[PDB]
């Protein structure tokens, strides 16, 4: 246990860091797009209220960004620290994208900084749109490149194993692996979406309470509509990624949907409870999706989990996450799909609290679905790294340091999150 506790403690710490990181990140990814769009709408419409929401957002986008950065550094460093032998092999291959994430981030950060400190000096709004285009591009570029890491972690190749030593590396093969498309896509979509619901959750708060129709109805009207779109795309690329899994890594998917047994027409599950050792409790399941319109043939035989080695299978508590993530997906999509439809273009329900409440919950639900989803996609992953890559069990270092540093960091982040939330509310209540 002087070099096995960390096998767990590390996982635990890393979770605690990155879990935080993401709160301050998908915002970093989705917000700038929304900002760009708001500017663009304000410009195209000559409505200098949207143009106020762009900066009204940016002003906090900053604070989000920084907290993002520090946690980013944290994880960045923690990487090789907690998992040396991993990087001993794969570092050669991961090095680049990881860099390109932050490069893309600096590239965006320049223009972000320009807009931030030229919108109050130099000329014309288009010339500030053109500064806000590179930002979102650089944001999504981060995600592309950094996700290419995870995507690669999930799947080879671009390497060769000389009795353990990883060599003969092709950049773009390892970078542009089979998972990369679905990862990049689903991640971008479910991060445009998330922030899209996050802004709606401000507009619905501010509009619900001190009903300054002014910005706060326009905000909702846009953010909700875009949120709908992004949730739809998100779901599409969800089905896509699911199909990818069903074809290439059903170890996850079969654990997500508890398909121990391999079959042609295999029903999905809405929610259940199988305690790790075959204890089927709540059982609500429907016939199969990722075959009928995905594979175009309902009787496409889904691989079963039994057919996966039990040293190669991930946990069964994964299902719950799929439930969470997907159901949030659909529900939230519905809320979105109604708001603009029914609450605006039909029966003027906007001013009803019955929406504003749900729309206040909107963003938090999405972020939850984010954390959940990440847990799902990453935890279906623990028992493969130990094979085609290298033993997870033999990836960590020492115990009596990690256990404490974990708690130090725990505290640190606890403070971060809270403080950030506080300041980030204070600002909005100051109304600049």
């Amino acid at each position: 246990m002087n070099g096995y506790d960390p096998v767990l403690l590390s996982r635990i710490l890393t979770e605690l860091t990155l879990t935080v990181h993401i709160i301050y990140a998908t915002i970093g990814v989705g917000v700038p797009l929304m900002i760009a769009i708001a500017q663009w709408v304000g410009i195209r419409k000559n409505d200098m209220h949207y143009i106020l929401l762009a900066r009204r957002w940016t002003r906090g986008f900053v604070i989000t960004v920084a907290v993002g950065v520090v946690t980013g550094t944290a994880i960045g460093l923690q990487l090789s620290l907690l998992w040396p032998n991993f990087m001993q092999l794969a570092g050669q291959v991961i090095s680049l994208p990881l860099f390109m994430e932050t490069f893309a981030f600096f590239f965006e950060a320049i223009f972000l900084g320009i807009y931030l400190y030229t919108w109050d000096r130099f000329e014309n709004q288009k010339k500030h749109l053109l500064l806000l285009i590179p930002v979102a591009i650089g944001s999504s570029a981060s995600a592309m490149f950094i996700t290419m890491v995870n995507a690669f972690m999930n799947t080879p190749q671009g390497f060769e194993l000389k009795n353990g030593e990883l060599v003969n590396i092709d950049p773009i093969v390892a970078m542009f692996n089979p998972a990369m498309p679905t990862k990049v896509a689903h991640v971008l979509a479910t991060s445009y979406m998330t922030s899209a619901f996050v802004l709606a959750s401000i507009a619905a708060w501010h509009l619900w309470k001190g009903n300054r129709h002014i910005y706060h109805r326009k905000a909702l009207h846009l953010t909700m509509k875009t949120a709908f779109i992004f949730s739809v795309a998100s779901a599409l690329v969800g089905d896509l990624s699911g199909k990818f899994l069903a074809e290439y890594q059903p170890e996850k998917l079969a654990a997500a949907e508890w398909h121990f047994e391999t079959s042609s027409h295999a029903p999905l599950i809405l929610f259940g409870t199988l305690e790790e050792d075959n204890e089927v409790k709540y059982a609500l399941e429907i016939p199969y999706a990722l075959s009928i319109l995905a594979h175009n043939h309902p009787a496409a035989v889904v691989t079963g989990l039994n057919d996966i080695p039990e040293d190669e299978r991930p946990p069964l508590y994964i299902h719950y996450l799929f439930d969470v993530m997907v159901t949030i997906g659909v529900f939230l999509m519905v809320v979105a799909a109604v708001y603009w439809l029914g609450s605006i273009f039909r029966w003027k329900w906007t001013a009803k609290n019955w929406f504003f409440g749900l729309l206040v919950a909107g963003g938090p639900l999405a972020m939850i679905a984010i954390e959940a989803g990440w847990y799902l996609a990453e935890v279906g992953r623990q028992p493969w790294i130990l094979r085609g890559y290298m033993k997870t069990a033999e990836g960590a270092t020492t115990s009596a340091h990690v256990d404490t540093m974990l708690v130090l960091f725990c505290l640190l982040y606890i403070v971060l999150v809270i403080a950030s939330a506080t300041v980030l509310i204070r600002m909005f209540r100051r109304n600049p």
């Binding site: 797009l33 769009i37 663009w40 709408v41 195209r44 419409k45 089979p178 498309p181 679905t182 990049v184 896509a185 689903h186 971008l188 979509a189 445009y192 009207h221 846009l222 509509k225 875009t226 779109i229 992004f230 739809v232 795309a233 599409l236 690329v237 896509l240 990624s241 199909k243 990818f244 603009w340 605006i344 273009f345």
Partner: peptide, 30 residues
């Protein structure tokens, strides 16, 4: 190939749809 490419497409679409909202039912309506 089609389903390996498709996602990013769907995304790209969703983006410019998300823009197109700003022109359709934002600029000339509501």
């Amino acid at each position: 190939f089609l389903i390996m490419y498709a996602p990013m497409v769907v995304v790209a679409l969703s983006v410019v749809a998300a823009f197109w909202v700003g022109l359709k039912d934002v600029h000339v309506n509501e």
